[PDB]
């Protein structure tokens, strides 16, 4: 990609200031998800709690206590009614938000896996995809509680998963050095993209839902294209050997993000692969970083219980 498009200009160094510092957690912030109103972000920590934050004014709107402190994912509903959280206890619990009583309660404690639940997203308010430790992606209905389609096909463990924005199809990144493009309706694989040396610790989808970037542990982000079935861009450089732990595109697709085990977020130009920014606010592993859907902010949670919101 970058060998073709180097005729255009680069956007220079992007200076991102720590606009907010959402303190409050007591352990490692393992995953976060932005809302769809660009204002409430849920983030889950391995001390038990998942906190729904008001990002505009640094306020903890909700603090949901789990039955199992081990959580490894979260997802905020597009309609804002539900919030999912799964983990090592294999039960991707769906909690409610717009309750008449007004206290967060467990709407469902869905089960059906024999591995840990790695990463879950919401298709609609009544359908959830979860990626698991027993190597099978899963698409669940919250009401009946049963797995609508359990996508088998991964040989090794599958560590993350991300939706295309049109909620019709998704991509699951696994430890077999390959991301598989699943589909909701047909229930089977469309394409299986390889090209990695090692595992895939996190994945995300570029706005058009015609691309996605895999976050490996060899510090090599790889933008893939769906229809061609080949690796498109190899975001990599020397002096970064640590593991990628979340990827996040921007609203325009120009500015990809990454969060490393090098203790600092790396902001990559998606067209020229240069490290166009460094977000070194933390002192430990950047587990999760998200870009809100309107494209205004960037929030980032890391293993030091700090959620820094960088504009």
């Amino acid at each position: 990609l970058s060998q073709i498009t180097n005729n255009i200009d680069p956007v220079g160094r992007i200076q991102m200031r720590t606009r907010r510092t959402l303190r409050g957690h007591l352990a490692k912030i393992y995953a976060m998800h932005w809302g769809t109103d660009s204002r409430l972000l849920v983030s889950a920590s391995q001390d038990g709690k998942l906190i729904i934050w008001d990002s505009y004014t640094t306020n903890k709107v909700h603090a949901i206590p789990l039955r199992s402190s081990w959580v490894m994912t979260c997802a905020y509903a597009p309609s804002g009614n539900y919030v999912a959280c799964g983990g090592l206890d294999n039960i991707c619990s769906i909690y409610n938000l717009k309750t008449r009583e007004g206290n967060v309660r467990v709407s469902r404690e869905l089960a059906g896996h024999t591995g840990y639940l790695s990463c879950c997203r919401f298709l609609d308010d009544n359908q959830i995809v979860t990626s698991s430790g027993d190597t099978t992606c899963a698409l669940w209905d919250i009401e009946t509680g049963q797995q609508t389609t359990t996508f088998t096909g991964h040989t090794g463990d599958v560590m993350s998963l991300s939706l295309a924005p049109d909620t019709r199809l998704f991509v699951s990144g696994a430890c077999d050095a390959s991301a598989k493009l699943w589909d909701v309706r047909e229930g089977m694989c469309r394409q299986t993209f390889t090209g990695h040396e090692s595992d895939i610790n996190a994945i995300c989808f570029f706005p058009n839902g015609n691309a996605f970037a895999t976050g490996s542990d060899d510090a090599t982000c790889r933008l893939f294209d769906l229809r061609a079935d080949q690796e498109l861009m190899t975001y990599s450089h020397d002096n970064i050997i640590c593991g990628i732990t979340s990827v996040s595109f921007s609203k325009s697709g120009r500015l990809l993000l990454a969060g490393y085990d090098d203790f600092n977020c790396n902001v990559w130009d998606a067209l020229k692969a240069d490290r166009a920014g460094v977000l070194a606010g933390h002192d430990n592993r950047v587990s999760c970083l998200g870009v809100t859907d309107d494209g205004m902010a960037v929030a980032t949670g890391s293993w030091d219980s700090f959620l820094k919101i960088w504009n």
């Binding site: 990609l1 498009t5 004014t57 691309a211 500015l255 494209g295 504009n311």
Partner: protein, 39 residues
């Protein structure tokens, strides 16, 4: 499927959308919702 054509498609799409991007362009701090809010 002619990888040059699809990465060119990615390029023209992102060049179409890179104008009104609220992150790579920047903020004027009044249209920004994330002012530092001394209070």
């Amino acid at each position: 499927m002619l990888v040059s054509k699809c990465c060119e498609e990615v390029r023209d799409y992102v060049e179409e959308r890179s104008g009104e991007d609220p992150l790579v362009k920047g903020i004027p701090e009044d249209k920004n919702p994330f002012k530092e809010l001394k209070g």
